[PDB]
Design a protein around this nucleic acid. Structure first.
Ligand SMILES: [Mg+2]
Ligand SMILES: [Mg+2]
Ligand SMILES: [Mg+2]
Ligand SMILES: [Mg+2]
Ligand SMILES: [Mg+2]
Ligand SMILES: [Mg+2]
Length: 191
RNA sequence: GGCAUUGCCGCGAAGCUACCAUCCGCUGGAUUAUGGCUGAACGCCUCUAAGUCAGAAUCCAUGCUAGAACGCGGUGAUUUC
């Protein structure tokens, strides 16, 4: 249909500064600085009042306007990650063999090490992406917590941990063992 | 010692040679299917549309062979008459 103009609003809270040169977005907040290259989308950013950015697509087709809202969501996630942070809680699930998850170092590289998954003698190692913090939750049995500014990095680190523990050659409806994301929220409570 | 078209027999070094002998046969990246992340379209959802993770005896490299006889480089010496 080639809609004349489509636009989305990105709300900027008080303690956040958004610097957008051509299509490289830098978001600065209390928790840190995030950066995203969006030169692949052909959108136009415009600051309105220092609390509102508008992102627009002119003469855009269906896919172009579909990507506009994706741009808005990505910038919103950047802002949410520098203000509230992102935290993913994963639970270990096993029928018989306890899963042994720890943090080890290889040349100072901070791997999540998984042993005894379904009795395996193989040691699985999932690197920790920079910016992601791993904390093992006390008062909850078999819970690993991944926290960070970038939802992309924390969710991909959690997904790597989940994927490393896929069951092979078994009915997965029965052999349900693995490390599964049980919660995805923010670092700051009740916000 | 000759001849017997290598006269025949045993052993027989060298050379050649046998899964009949011994040794040796490399590790990186990009991918497929697929499973995912974020994420709209479609206020939800969604691996997909933008972006993106992993991933096959695959592919391209590393490695190995040849070296273009009209591809190239470096370097030595270049004729007293
Ligand atoms: Mg079976
Ligand atoms: Mg005679
Ligand atoms: Mg004779
Ligand atoms: Mg999701
Ligand atoms: Mg795509
Ligand atoms: Mg030649």
């Amino acid at each position: 249909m080639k809609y004349i103009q489509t636009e989305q609003q990105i709300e900027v809270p008080e303690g956040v500064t958004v610097s957008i040169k051509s299509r490289i977005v830098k978001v600065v907040g209390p928790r840190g600085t995030l950066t995203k290259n969006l030169k692949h989308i052909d959108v136009t950013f415009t600051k309105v009042n220092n609390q509102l950015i508008k992102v627009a697509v002119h003469n855009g087709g269906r896919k172009h306007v579909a990507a506009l809202r994706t741009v808005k969501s990505l910038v919103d996630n950047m802002i949410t990650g520098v203000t509230k942070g992102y935290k993913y809680k994963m639970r270990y699930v096993y029928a018989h063999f306890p899963i042994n998850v720890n943090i080890v170092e290889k040349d100072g590289a901070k791997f999540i090490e998984v042993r005894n998954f379904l009795g395996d003698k193989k040691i699985r190692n999932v690197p920790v992406r920079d910016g992601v913090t791993i904390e093992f939750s006390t008062n909850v049995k078999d819970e690993i917590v991944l926290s960070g500014n970038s939802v992309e990095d924390v969710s991909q680190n959690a997904a790597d941990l989940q994927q490393i523990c896929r069951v092979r050659n078994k009915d997965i409806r029965k052999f349900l063992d693995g490390i599964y994301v049980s919660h995805k929220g923010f670092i700051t409570e009740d916000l």
